[PDB]
Amino acid sequence: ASIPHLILELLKCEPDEPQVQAKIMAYLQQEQAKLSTFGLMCKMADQTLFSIVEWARSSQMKLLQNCWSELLILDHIYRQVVHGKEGSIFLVTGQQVDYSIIASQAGATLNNLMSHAQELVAKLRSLQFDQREFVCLKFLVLFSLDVQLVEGVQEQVNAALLDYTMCNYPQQTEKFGQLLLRLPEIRAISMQAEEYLYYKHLNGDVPYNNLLIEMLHA
């Protein structure tokens, strides 16, 4: 136990990590059977976003169109908080792109986006961000107060998260408030991520088909 009942519900709506990670890699594998590294990544992000909408089978398109990018960032950030080694980066497929490569190939804008995600991952590892809080933030990001049953789910998840962290991280007087402050940082990074990808689209760099742009354009 030691986990409020709501947080136990939400944890039961989580996807199988090692399953969807092989499904996604086994999709990109047969995709090259060309397109660029940026095209691979667009395809991957595309797939990740499919997992995310699937996952959103729990407690619709007006919401998803709000946070799709915030969810994609938050997912990526949590992967680095958990599995993240220093100097490199882990993708939903398992690959380990070193920051040497990021700084060598990629340009200024994307390098800045990575820097911001690392300020966040640092911050969250420092807070000891854990799975229970992770899933809470998902729902707080999905069920935005910026788009009825929303205020509802927001009040409830807030309550549960506040109790969970007060009781499980007593030595951190400030944790609840700290986590919540990452939410507007995630949004700011997601705004810069949309704009960067929008420019890649205007320049023909994005693959003919991809869910990201559909969402962006709506």
Partner: protein
């Protein structure tokens, strides 16, 4: 063997001679006391179901003690809990909580305790049977060990569950909880009772009732206790309750203990102490008075110095200092003791990076108060307040073209313009403020939509305009147009100041 014993007593537990069923029961309670037989019982639905139903509708004390005791014994096994659950025993146990006899209460509450802890669905079940009311009512009992299990049950039911909380509130839970903290010294009980209060204090309906029940003063008694875990529930709870306590009296001891804890070896005790003090001194003049009297100002400056760049500490501490230096009988001695205690330079240092906006907002507000005292007018200038204050102002004004790190940049415009408004009471300061080429901004600020920004902008131009060249400089900037249109404004402050500027 046992498998043959069971189906027998099952049939006797359903007989119609209360002496038979009574003897059936004394029988089974003995059997459950042994490993093997007990296993046979919880493997027998008919039997378990029969035991519950007998305990439910009976009126013999003896059969009640033996059925309750039996469920207590099955409740030590995962499959025992499961049998009691499926068999509807939770509602019957909640009924036993009504019992006068103390052996039954013990059995019922412990069984309920193991259910709540290790059996899924039990919490919802215990709530639906009205278990909360019963448990709150049992709080006037006097067996402290018993009270320990009861409060622990309330905590399990209360945790992360706003519904249940509101229920405990409505049963008089707060007053009963606070009374336990005022009465007993059993660390385990006080610890379990303080978790319930902790959990309850985050609820906005419960918070006022706990405060009303003398909760803060009661928690105050336990802050020096040897038990670190007890002391941390008390600080957590005190911190949550303290934004809602400007009412209370009898606070002298608590405030006193709070100041002493500022010196704790424990960085966390220290952090909460500042936060609660910040909270209790906010817009409450009698607390400002009492904290100042036991050397609060001295203790808070020591704390800011000790914390260095640790903002979890300096931010609550600065906040308290801001409360302590305004609007009370001893506000003036305090604006001075901050300087006298080698606090000025560090307060101004905190305006610079690595500080974040929450600390910066607090510090800006403290500096505004410190400036009210003329003897700080010079020290604050020597330390570089003004260039930094202006730098932050133009930075937050430009960023108005939402909530950056929790802080609206429109709060940094106002606070900065306000700190300058007070600093400008000194001619040397006015020369510096003019120098930084501020006038065009203050005039631009007159058009700000926020009434409070107009006010401070009109306030600083007013203090500047007491000097001829300044007064003219302001004219030459297109001030006379917006200024006049402000003469007719809702709030007095903007009106009066606007008039005073025009005056020159």
């Amino acid at each position: 063997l046992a498998t043959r014993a069971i189906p027998e007593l099952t049939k006797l537990l359903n007989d119609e001679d209360q002496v038979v069923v009574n003897k059936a029961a004394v029988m089974v309670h003995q059997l459950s006391k042994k490993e093997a037989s007990r296993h046979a019982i919880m493997r027998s639905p008919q039997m378990v179901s029969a035991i519950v139903r007998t305990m439910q509708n009976t009126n013999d004390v003896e059969t009640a003690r033996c059925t309750a005791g039996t469920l207590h014994n099955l409740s030590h096994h995962r499959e025992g809990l499961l049998a009691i659950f499926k068999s509807g025993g939770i509602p019957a146990l909640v009924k036993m909580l009504g019992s006068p006899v103390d052996s039954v209460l013990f059995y019922a509450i412990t069984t309920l305790h193991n259910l709540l802890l290790h059996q899924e669905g039990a919490k919802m079940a215990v709530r639906l049977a009205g278990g909360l009311q019963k448990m709150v009512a049992l709080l006037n009992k006097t067996n402290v060990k018993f009270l320990a299990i009861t409060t622990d049950c309330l905590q399990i039911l209360a945790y992360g569950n706003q519904e249940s909380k509101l229920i405990i509130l409505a049963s008089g839970g707060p007053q009963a909880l606070v009374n336990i903290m005022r009465t007993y010294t059993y660390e385990k009980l006080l610890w379990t009772t303080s978790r319930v209060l902790k959990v309850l204090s985050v609820c906005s309906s419960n918070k006022p009732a706990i405060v009303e029940a003398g909760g803060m003063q009661a928690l105050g008694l336990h802050l020096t206790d040897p038990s670190q875990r007890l002391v941390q529930n008390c600080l957590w709870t005190l911190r949550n309750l303290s934004d809602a306590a400007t009412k209370q009296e009898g606070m002298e001891g608590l405030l006193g203990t709070l100041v002493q804890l500022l010196g704790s070896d424990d960085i966390n005790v220290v952090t909460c102490a500042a936060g609660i003090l910040s909270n209790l001194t906010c817009n409450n003049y009698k607390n400002k008075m009492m904290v100042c009297q036991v050397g609060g100002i001295e203790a808070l400056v020591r704390t800011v110095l000790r914390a260095g760049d640790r903002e979890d500490i300096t931010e609550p501490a600065i906040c308290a200092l801001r409360h302590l230096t305004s609007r009370h009988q001893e506000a003036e001695m305090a604006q001075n003791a901050v300087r006298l205690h080698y606090g000025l330079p560090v307060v101004v240092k905190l305006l610079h990076p690595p500080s974040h906006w929450p600390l910066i907002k607090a510090t800006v507000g403290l500096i505004r108060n410190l400036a009210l005292c003329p003897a700080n007018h010079a020290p604050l200038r020597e330390q570089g307040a003004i260039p930094r204050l202006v730098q932050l102002l133009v930075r937050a004004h430009q960023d108005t073209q939402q909530f950056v790190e929790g802080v609206r940049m429109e709060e940094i415009v106002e606070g900065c313009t306000g700190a300058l408004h007070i600093l400008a009471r000194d001619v040397h300061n006015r020369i510096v403020i003019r120098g930084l080429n501020t006038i065009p901004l203050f005039v631009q600020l007159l058009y700000s939509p926020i009434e409070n920004i107009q006010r401070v902008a009109a306030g600083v131009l007013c203090e500047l305009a007491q000097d001829k060249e300044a007064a003219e400089a302001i004219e030459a900037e297109g001030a006379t147009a917006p200024l006049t249109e402000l003469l007719h404004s809702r709030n007095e402050g903007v009106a009066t100041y606007a008039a005073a500027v025009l005056f020159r």
